Structure formats: structure tokens, C-alpha cells
Amino acid sequence: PHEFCSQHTMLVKQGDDYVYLPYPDPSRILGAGCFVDDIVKTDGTLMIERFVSLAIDAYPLTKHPNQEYADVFHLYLQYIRKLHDELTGHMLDMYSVMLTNDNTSRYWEPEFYEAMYTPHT
RNA sequence: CUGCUCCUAGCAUGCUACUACCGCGUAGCAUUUCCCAUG
Numbered sequence: 001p002h003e004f005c006s007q008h009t010m011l012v013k014q015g016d017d018y019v020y021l022p023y024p025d026p027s028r029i030l031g032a033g034c035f036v037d038d039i040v041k042t043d044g045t046l047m048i049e050r051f052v053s054l055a056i057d058a059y060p061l062t063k064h065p066n067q068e069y070a071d072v073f074h075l076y077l078q079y080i081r082k083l084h085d086e087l088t089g090h091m092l093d094m095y096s097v098m099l100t101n102d103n104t105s106r107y108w109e110p111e112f113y114e115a116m117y118t119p120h121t
Numbered sequence: 122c123u124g125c126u127c128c129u130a131g132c133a134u135g136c137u138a139c140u141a142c143c144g145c146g147u148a149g150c151a152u153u154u155c156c157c158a159u160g
Binding site for chain 2 (some may be wrong): 048049052053056057116
């Protein structure tokens with residue numbers, strides 16, 4: 001369908017055959033990233049799960065024919081990474097201690113996002 | 122306000138695996154043992 005619940009339907013190849021993936025408009029995602037209330041996202045170092053949640057809905061933009069949408073997805077990934085590492089520096093240096101296990105690598109590789117659409121859970 | 126999802130924490134549940142010692146079951150086993158008159 002051309003549009004349903006503000007989701008554009010795209011058909012791509014997943015696994016061994018083809019399935020439909022609903023992808024959102026890009027402008028809405030970028031606007032939600034840019035403009036917010038105060039402190040809710042005035043400094044993302046305080047709150048990172050926002051962009052994690054945002055990226056999950058931006059994943060089907062990767063399989064789009066035009067590449068700008070994949071660029072948006074990768075931009076979100078890079079920003080998540082930069083936020084996480086700068087948070088690590090801020091916390092480790094001028095405080096005492098942060099890290100014994102990372103467990104946070106997963107949030108910058110498309111393996112975790114793609115599992116969101118795997119027909120098994 | 123309804124619906125979906127994520128993360129964290131906690132709780133509780135189930136499951137698995139490990140160790141531990143205990144108890145119980147089982148085998149090998151080392152062991153340590155000597156027969157005699159008669160319807």
C-alpha cells in the first residue's frame with residue numbers, strides 16, 4: 001500500500017526469500033532527533049536510550065534503493081557510538097571507576113537491529 | 122487515553138550446568154574365615 005499509518009511499505013530480500021518492510025519518512029526521524037523539550041534531549045550524554053529507540057525504526061531505511069536513508073541510519077549509529085565513548089571518557093577520568101565488562105558494543109552493529117524483524121521471538 | 126517496542130533495576134518463577142559434602146543404592150575388592158557323632 002502507498003501509505004498506511006504513516007508507514008511506506010518496501011519489499012526487499014531477507015534471509016532466503018522476499019518479505020515486506022515498513023519504513024518511515026526520513027524527515028520525521030531527523031526532526032525528532034533535532035528538536036526536543038529541555039533536558040529530555042538537551043544533552044544526549046544524560047540519556048542515550050532515545051537514539052537507540054529511534055534507530056530501531058530507522059533500520060528499514062538501509063535497504064532502500066536511494067542511499068541517503070542508509071546514510072541517515074549510519075549517522076544515527078555513529079552518533080550513538082560517539083555519545084557512548086565520550087560518556088565513557090567523562091565518567092572514567094574525573095571520577096574514579098567505570099568498567100569491568102563492556103556489554104555495550106551491540107548498540108553500534110546492524111546485527112542487533114536486524115533481529116527486530118526476524119520472524120521468531 | 123489506547124496500542125506497540127526498548128533499556129535498566131528489582132522480584133519471583135522455571136530450567137540447565139558445576140562444585141561441595143552428606144545420606145542412600147550398586148560392583149570390583151582387599152580381606153579373613155573351617156565340620157564332627159549320629160535314627
